[PDB]
């Protein structure tokens, strides 16, 4: 019996998770769903964005599904970003990125590769302060996280085919900090000698992933870098309604969309759904449950292939529809 | 006659910068330029990436054009970048990026944009730290600096048909370094009231970029990110090999390409120098030669859609073939 | 009448102010006291060591007098320094800490000088971050807050006999925050002829200061250089039973004994109210009742010479003896 | 014989150091000299405060004595201050610095104590920015540095009869930082269950050493705080004169009087070479001559108490006078 906790969040978090949770429920797997809070909305009712009891529930779980919850864009008295303080918290250090050519119009063709986050530290520390008109931000990197990162990164190379990995950075500009985690990834590479690393200016990276994507296995790199590679490695394959990750840990992991609450289209119903359970897809894998796995994507593949499809797919099918055609198609497998 | 300063810097800045000189030479105007020295060739001869003398040549000129130079990914005595250098001492702090679609193969219809990136401080502040095995480096936004480069994109946006900017930050995470700088910058929108000011999330912006560039007209944005955000955006429009940019402060200006030293390629004979081409059409634009600037893209355009092509565009055309086509093309308008 | 905000605080501060307030009442003076709470006991009681209740009622009265309260040696959850909390948020730029020889046994003659703290910035901002087995603090210098603490500290030495200012630093080793107040207190300098300004080096300052305090008249520093100097200067002239100050901004002031809530004593009955009785001195002088604050002052130096002293001073009095034999002293003048 | 490396430096140290120089000889112990510069003079020969040569010589001599260097109080570019370089450069992370009770007029008596400075970090980290009108210097403390201290402290009071050991800073304010340090210095205590630890408030501790000087053994703390408490002991026992010092390192170690180059006195062949002299026997100590040590302090002591004496000390005589009386007192015991 697998116990789930699962977390809606704030927006299309609510339209997703339920869709997910649906399709989890199609795999006949046993599972047992624990619901908790956490977001905006989660801050405005309890007085905090993360409740002490949404870490116990996650903590007394086997893994953690999260929708997505809204940052004002300004400091708000007693507010702290939800997922971010997660990540911290539970020492959520790996961020798992896989981008995936998909059979829809928008994507690309020929392209599979993983981006591989530092999920704790660089400007994400959050260590901000303000002087008079001038405000400072510590971008932090220690060689502890380079070596933890690193070696997940290597990892997942070594378990792939092409056996690449891309280091981005921006050392040249920055020796001590970007420079500290380039040098530290190649340092713990030489235990993996069947992995073929390269670095790469993430500037240059940018620009390889829009103009050649098919060229990368697996791509390295820090906290804000990463965020940004990761939203447009999603819009190379279909965009974000059909991206996953992994917030991996030592003993946890919590399992979200790369997308956020999506406010322009939260209460419209065609949220696209794909996100959320191929992340849920991600999370039997890490679970031991690779079949089941490998049968939702199979199966989120199909749908996607011959429809119906939502808005952001060139459709006009609802959230509802869309999951349901999944279901169906999961059942048939 | 026009004083131009020329700085080739290192690897392909030695073809491109020449190529550039002479289709300036071929529009007939009166030029008188001024070779100058920088980058890490210089480095190792002078024991300075940056020459006295070179900084006295650039305020010596009415504009500069500039090749690129190599940065190593670790620190070294007593270098610091060359363009870095010359951005914050000559204080250029508008980096203007336009990427517009072009008549060749790996390029988008449909895309006419320019990013705005403060050139000036935010992790550009260049003061790291390392203590033990932890590395921190400042992240800065001042008011004033935001205020100068919000100015100079409402102007520009002020300037084109669209009248729409989009300020890229992350102040969902960084409200107090990045919130300046969009409070900032909507602060001065006040004075610009035709034009139609929006926010957007960096990673989000990324996305869009990808999948919907021509919905953007103006992009303002902070140090970094807009490195980052302007390789994508060449890459949208044909490459490196075609994107243009200029560094301007209040009483001069520094033209390069976006692309740097290329040293895959450095001393092939194959570069393209469209990049470098355009930038001086940018300058020659600030100098007030605007027909000229127009006849300058006119040619490369032309050049571009009939060939012949560089490799990077899929053809077998060496540099000076190309720039031949060029001066001819100009020629013949 | 003048509103008189009473706050008590922790440990002794619960013994001197309550006498402080019988002095102030003997003075005949039209006065009506409010109380107010901080301090570590309020932060047990209410969960914040500064409720906002406090802020209004300082606000509300022409000047405050606070007694001392215990700070933790340690982060605790929701606690913060209450009198560092009013110093930043009510803006009391300016510490002003007397050090005058009284007929005292413990007490060097011939000493009569101003430490004038600044009560803002410099390390007191507050700002530290730890990393795994590293701590980072900010010690900030702003030009502005060096203005103010610089003026300040001119004004009281222009209307004092000697007219003399020494500015107490260490710019030698760190030039560009030391530096900064340096050369800010040296040029506000330029507006006020009438003042002899000297610079002293601080660790040579506080080797001067034991060997021949009669020779300095002002003494202008920052926030840590100042509380040390402050507490030393105080044993030269019988030790912190005697010692007062004003936290001094622009429209209100909070006066308050040097020393703190002395918990090895706090309870005993034998606390030298002298120190919050000045200091209530130095109120009545701040609201334009210089003959009431001369009285207090008389009548305190009557007393230390006269006896009953407290065990400070190496009588047995109790604080209730001394009390009633300063009030005896000011009902005969 | 043992190699001792003799520095000058600036001011004062011309006239001290040739002294102290003259007393080693007159001990009869097989001593070969080796001379090197240093300092601000030093830096105007030959554009830097410290010489390859310098270094070289210091690591290539059993140990050096070190008379005071000049420093600015402005960024001149290319000047570092000199011992501050050797102390980091080095790594002569404890400095060492006894306070005692001599027979002469400006005197305290019953003064023994140790400070026991932490030499390497805090704020000498020498990390100071500006930006606009704000600068920021970093105040860094390790876990590392502070056990090191700590150990050196605690190894010192167990060597002494008292065994007492206390802790100065300001963790009250500074929680993080300050914080590390205490605790820090309280674990390692552990392993010395012989020594007697209390902690106190850096304020305090200069009041309680102004007033009872008596009760202090051993005294550490931190970086700054260490050399503000030290000129004031300094000051208690006839002042910077007499006061002498040790930076001890792990391998070689630098002695230097406290006081710096006086430049109100150099040139007068006035300056007190005591301070000088006793580091000489500081450092004679360190080196295995532990006899020789007690035969220059009571040479020290006859002359200190039967005259004659230098101007800091109320008498008329010069260096070189009160130095041959010191080399005569030495070579009649
Ligand atoms: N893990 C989390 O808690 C995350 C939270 N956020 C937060 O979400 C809020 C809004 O962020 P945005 O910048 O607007 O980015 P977003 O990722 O929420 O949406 C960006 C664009 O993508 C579209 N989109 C996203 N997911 C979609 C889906 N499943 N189906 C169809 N369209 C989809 C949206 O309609 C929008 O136009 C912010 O407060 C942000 O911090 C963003 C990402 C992750
Ligand atoms: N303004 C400057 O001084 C700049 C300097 N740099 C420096 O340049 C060096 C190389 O940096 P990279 O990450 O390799 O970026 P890059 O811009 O030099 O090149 C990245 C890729 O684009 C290709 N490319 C660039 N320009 C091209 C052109 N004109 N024609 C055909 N192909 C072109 C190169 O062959 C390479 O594969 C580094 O040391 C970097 O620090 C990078 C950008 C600007
Ligand atoms: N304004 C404020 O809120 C202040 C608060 N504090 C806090 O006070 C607490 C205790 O601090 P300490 O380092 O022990 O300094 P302290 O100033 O409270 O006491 C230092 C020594 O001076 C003696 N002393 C102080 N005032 C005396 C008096 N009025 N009559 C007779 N003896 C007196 C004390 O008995 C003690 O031995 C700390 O938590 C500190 O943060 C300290 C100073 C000011
Ligand atoms: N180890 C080193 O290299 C040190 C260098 N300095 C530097 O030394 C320079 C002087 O700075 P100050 O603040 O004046 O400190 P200082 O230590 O040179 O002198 C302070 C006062 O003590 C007197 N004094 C010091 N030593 C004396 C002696 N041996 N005999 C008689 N009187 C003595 C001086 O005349 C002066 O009035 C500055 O440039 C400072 O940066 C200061 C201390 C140590
Ligand atoms: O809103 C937040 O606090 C976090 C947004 C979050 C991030 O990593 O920055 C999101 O953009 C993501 O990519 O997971
Ligand atoms: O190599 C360097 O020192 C500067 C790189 C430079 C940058 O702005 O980050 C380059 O990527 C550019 O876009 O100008
Ligand atoms: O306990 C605190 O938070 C501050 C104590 C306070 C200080 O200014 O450091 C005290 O020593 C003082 O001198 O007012
Ligand atoms: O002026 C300098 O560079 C060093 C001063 C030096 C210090 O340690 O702060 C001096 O005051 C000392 O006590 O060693
Ligand atoms: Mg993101
Ligand atoms: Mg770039
Ligand atoms: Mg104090
Ligand atoms: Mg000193």
Redesign the interface.
Known sequence: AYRICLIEGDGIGHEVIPAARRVLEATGLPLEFVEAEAGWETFERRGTSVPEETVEKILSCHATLFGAAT?????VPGFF?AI?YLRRRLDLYANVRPAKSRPVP?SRPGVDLVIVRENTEG??????????????????????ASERIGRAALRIAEGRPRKTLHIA????????????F??TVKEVAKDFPLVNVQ?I????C??????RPERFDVIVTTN??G??????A???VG??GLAPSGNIGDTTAVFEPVH?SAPDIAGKGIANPTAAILSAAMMLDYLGEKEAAKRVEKAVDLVLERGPRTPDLGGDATTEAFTEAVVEALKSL
Chains 1, 2, 3, 4 share one sequence.
């Open positions: 940052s004002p864009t300004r400091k970003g971010r928008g400007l994400y520390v959050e260590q901000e302060r303000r002087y008079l008109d001038v405000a400072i931000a510590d971008a932090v990197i220690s060689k502890k950075h921006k050392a040249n500009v920055l020796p001590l900090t970007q420079g500290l380039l040098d670095d200016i993430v500037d240059n940018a620009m390889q992933l829009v103009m804000l870098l965020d940004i590679l990761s939203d447009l999603a819009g190379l965009g974000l956020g």
